[PDB]
Design a protein around this ligand. Structure first.
Ligand SMILES: Nc1ncnc2c1ncn2[C@@H]1O[C@H](COP(=O)(O)OP(=O)(O)OP(=O)(O)O)[C@@H](O)[C@H]1O
Ligand SMILES: Nc1ncnc2c1ncn2[C@@H]1O[C@H](COP(=O)(O)OP(=O)(O)OP(=O)(O)O)[C@@H](O)[C@H]1O
Ligand SMILES: C[C@@H]1O[C@@H]1P(=O)(O)O
Ligand SMILES: C[C@@H]1O[C@@H]1P(=O)(O)O
Lengths: 265, 265
């Protein structure tokens, strides 16, 4: 044993930090180039803005790539991994769209290029820039997304927005809550699986085999949960009030449906 | 005295690293929103691509903001320094345009958001991300630009592309050559001032008072020259061959006109 800070955890506890990920399905049609649903962005932004005020300096917003990200990956040449570099430009545009919208309603939203801040080493993302922590400490809202990241051999890899919360794990103090908003109510097994134990999540993986994206979400959120995070897969809706995401899980409204991924506590 | 590596320097010596800055005047009309001269970008890119091959892993390309940067600064609200955040999005677009063009002709060009990598402390830019060095070591071409940078108080400042070479100073080993391509042949005093000693450049500053942008260039290049760099202000032209920028200054073609800023050596 090495010593570390004992962190109180449980469904009774308020999160110290929110990582909110908004799936591309919710504001973009992959098979419509450059599509962004401005109404969806507008409405989500209003709900994200209220979270950001409470979680000032204690939140990130992570955007899915939508048409932009999936186009960049579709149009690259796999014989030259460097052609993936266009993905960094694609996912910058989506971050811009969120940040512009949020600033328009008074949120101090700043887009940050994950590729300028993070690289891969033995497959694990490494935060390599101090700027993310600074931005948070200034009380601003980082707008993040997936990206094309370099590995230690100079090879670019597509790193999904779904995995971005992994990057926060060494940086966040206290209780991290990760919320992945998608176009389904959770992991469907048909019923939702309401609880997954990240120590042994084999039944959640077995459910995706039943129903064939979601694998990547599960992988990322298990990884996060094994490092103490309280993670959720749940349905996004542009107009839905998200104030409950500030609250202890045991206090959530009864109508809310999700898959909750944790280790004991 | 503290010891340090003795670096051979002089007009007889080949540069170890090239920082090439392309002024917005050369490819963009400030007062035409979103203007980018695609032909100018195309032609410059072909000439930059030859430098990047020789200087593989030993060069950065820095873009002026043009219409994009100056629009963002024009349209921000000075009563809320955070509205400058749109400048980061503006100068990302210009980096994208260069990097797309360069990749199209086989250069491993990758845009990097300076704001994600650098902050200001007591007015001095601080490189805060290890990713720039990595990208270079991978043999890629960073595409840089000016940006909105945070200070230590959380205030955003417009940091010109002209100042970006300053950020390289602690990072570059060996002889850095900085080349600022603009729409004039150098500092006009009318004749060009061919040599400026960065230790006491008072006559170059006196010339700008004669002729009223250029002040910022001089400040940045003096700063760089005082830390060993060999710096140039010279006229850019999309079709002009730049191969001479790989060569010792004493070997440059006789037709080339510039203002050279150095300390002794
Ligand atoms: N067991 C499962 N339960 C729920 N969804 C599942 C399951 N297995 C696979 N999925 C699929 O995963 C999808 C969610 O992942 P997906 O990557 O499509 O969404 P997103 O990231 O929100 O948006 P985008 O479509 O732009 O990537 C669901 O729509 C569903 O089709
Ligand atoms: N003594 C001087 N010698 C030469 N140019 C000078 C002098 N004093 C002021 N200048 C001005 O500085 C200009 C170059 O700086 P400027 O910022 O306009 O160019 P740029 O960065 O290349 O492009 P952009 O116009 O988009 O910023 C010249 O066109 C000139 O008008
Ligand atoms: C990184 C690529 O845009 C996709 P995702 O982030 O939605 O998985
Ligand atoms: C940073 C603002 O775009 C301008 P410049 O980089 O051309 O000075």
């Amino acid at each position: 044993h090495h010593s570390s800070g004992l962190v109180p955890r449980g469904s009774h506890m308020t999160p110290d930090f929110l990582a909110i990920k908004v799936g591309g399905s919710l504001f973009s049609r992959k098979d419509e180039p450059g599509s962004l649903d401005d109404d969806a962005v507008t409405r989500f932004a209003r709900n994200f803005a209220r979270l950001a005020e409470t979680y000032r300096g204690r939140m990130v917003l992570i955007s899915g790539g939508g048409a932009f990200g999936h186009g960049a990956i579709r149009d690259h040449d796999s014989t030259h991994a460097f052609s993936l570099a266009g993905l960094t430009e694609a996912t910058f545009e989506v971050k811009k769209r969120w940040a512009e919208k949020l600033r328009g309603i008074g949120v101090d939203a700043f887009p940050l290029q994950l590729a300028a801040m993070c690289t891969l080493r033995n497959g694990i993302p490494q935060l390599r820039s101090e700027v993310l922590r600074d931005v948070l400490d200034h009380g601003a809202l980082p707008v993040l997304a997936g990206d094309a990241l370099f590995d230690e051999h100079g090879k670019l890899w597509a790193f999904s927005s779904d995995r971005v919360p992994e990057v926060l794990l060494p940086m966040v103090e206290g209780r991290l809550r990760v919320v992945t908003l998608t176009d389904v109510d959770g992991i469907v097994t048909d019923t939702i699986l309401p609880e997954v134990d990240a120590r042994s999540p084999e039944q959640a993986y077995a459910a995706l085999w039943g129903s064939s994206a979601m694998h990547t979400k599960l992988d990322a959120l298990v990884t996060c949960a094994r490092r103490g995070a309280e993670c959720f897969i749940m349905r996004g809706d542009p107009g839905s009030d998200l104030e409950f995401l500030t609250a202890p899980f045991s206090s959530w409204p009864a109508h809310v449906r999700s898959t909750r991924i944790t280790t004991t506590a």
